[PDB]
Amino acid sequence: VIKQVMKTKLHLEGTVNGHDFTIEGKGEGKPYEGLQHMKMTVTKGAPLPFSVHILTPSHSKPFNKYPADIPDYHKQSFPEGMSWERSMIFEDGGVCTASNHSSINLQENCFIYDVKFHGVNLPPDGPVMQKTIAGWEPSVETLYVRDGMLKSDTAMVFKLKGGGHHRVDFKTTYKAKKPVKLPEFHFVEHRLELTKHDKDFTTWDQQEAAEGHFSPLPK
Amino acid sequence: SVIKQVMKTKLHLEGTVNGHDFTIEGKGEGKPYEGLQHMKMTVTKGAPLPFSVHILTPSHSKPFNKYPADIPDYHKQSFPEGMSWERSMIFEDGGVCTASNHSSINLQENCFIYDVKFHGVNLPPDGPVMQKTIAGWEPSVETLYVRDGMLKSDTAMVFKLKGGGHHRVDFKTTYKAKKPVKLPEFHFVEHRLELTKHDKDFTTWDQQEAAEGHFSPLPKA
């Protein structure tokens, strides 16, 4: 059911700093190569009063490159689908929660994402509300099974405009709708980039490269 | 350079975990440019330890990181003046450990001297640390970046439970060179710490660690 090239369609409803908004995404990628892109459009609540970088990682699990000896938890869950849930704890008290439902439209060869996003206690002079985030650095995600689900940890660090970094702890749970071959403990390299946009970020292009692997260090 | 292809290590650690005082003494060796090292630990006071010794193994040597030419080695550059590190370890079950070190060098002995403090609090009595159900650490990837001229890091250090399953410990570490050094850009460090040999009650044991720094292998557009 997962072809060498596949489309994506996203619908996200969010509330950040008491500001409601709807985002619509349309993209495509090479699932087995771990490459994908998507064009976002803030259909409601534009212009957003916060850094859109807090939302970019909440916009696609079937596009992770994996070796043959690591079962792909996400690809195996389709066509039944999966869901993912996540908490994002910032260094300054800010907390965002995101959750998704991923399904497939076999006719269109397109993945359907329905996402919820909630941002609270973002400090008014912090980098999210002040829009001083330049983008995310690449990241290494650590994944292991917990209760038959795939749990992961990621110190997702963003670059500040003017230099310096700010860490956001991501705790995610991936939940396949039907049982799949569970993988052993492993890592996923991630590089998320916001490449093009209009002046006030009502529309933008975001891409992601992702590769799973065991530790390269010998025992 | 003051850092040779082969270097010795000497460690002294004083700790208090679950209100239990103890001292560890370490003696080891490694290849600083290859990112390989090993240390023989001995609990000189407070043996046998009433908790899993795995909580202490990452507190026992920053001059032993392999780095490419385009990533300045923050730790090696800090010698002979030395460096120090500080760390918090937050467990999934409320347990908190804090560790801090002072690293110096004995140029005549070609030996790094480590003085360590360790404190463990609120470890649940039926948790994996007090129940000694930790089999060891999994390999890890640490993320490093500069903050106030110091080198900060974040590592989800996950340990394997005996009988399967995992338990995450959030490590927040700060490395502090005593004199200014060429600071590196944001990067990662692969770690694989292994406890390879020991006596029945872990009064002595052999610990080793492979560590390699690198930027992300993924291409940037």
Author numbering:
A (entry chain C): 3 to 61, 65 to 224
B (entry chain A): 2 to 61, 65 to 225
Give the original sentences from the paper that presented this experimental model.
Here, high-resolution X-ray crystal structures of four open-source chromoproteins, gfasPurple, amilCP, spisPink and eforRed, are presented. Like GFP, chromoprotein monomers have a β-barrel structure that contains a chromophore, which is autocatalytically constructed from adjacent X–tyrosine–glycine residues encoded within the protein sequence itself.
The reddish appearance of eforRed can be attributed to its intense, red-shifted fluorescence emission that peaks at 602 nm. Studies of photo-switchable fluorescent proteins indicate that coplanarity is more essential for fluorescence than a cis chromophore conformation, as fluorescence is also observed in mutants containing trans but coplanar chromophore variants. The other requirement in fluorescent chromoprotein variants is thought to be a histidine (His197) π-stacking with the tyrosyl moiety, which is observed in eforRed but not dsRed. Most notably, an unusual hydroxyl-to-methionine hydrogen bond was observed in eforRed between the tyrosyl moiety and Met161, while the equivalent Met159 in gfasPurple and amilCP only forms van der Waals interactions.
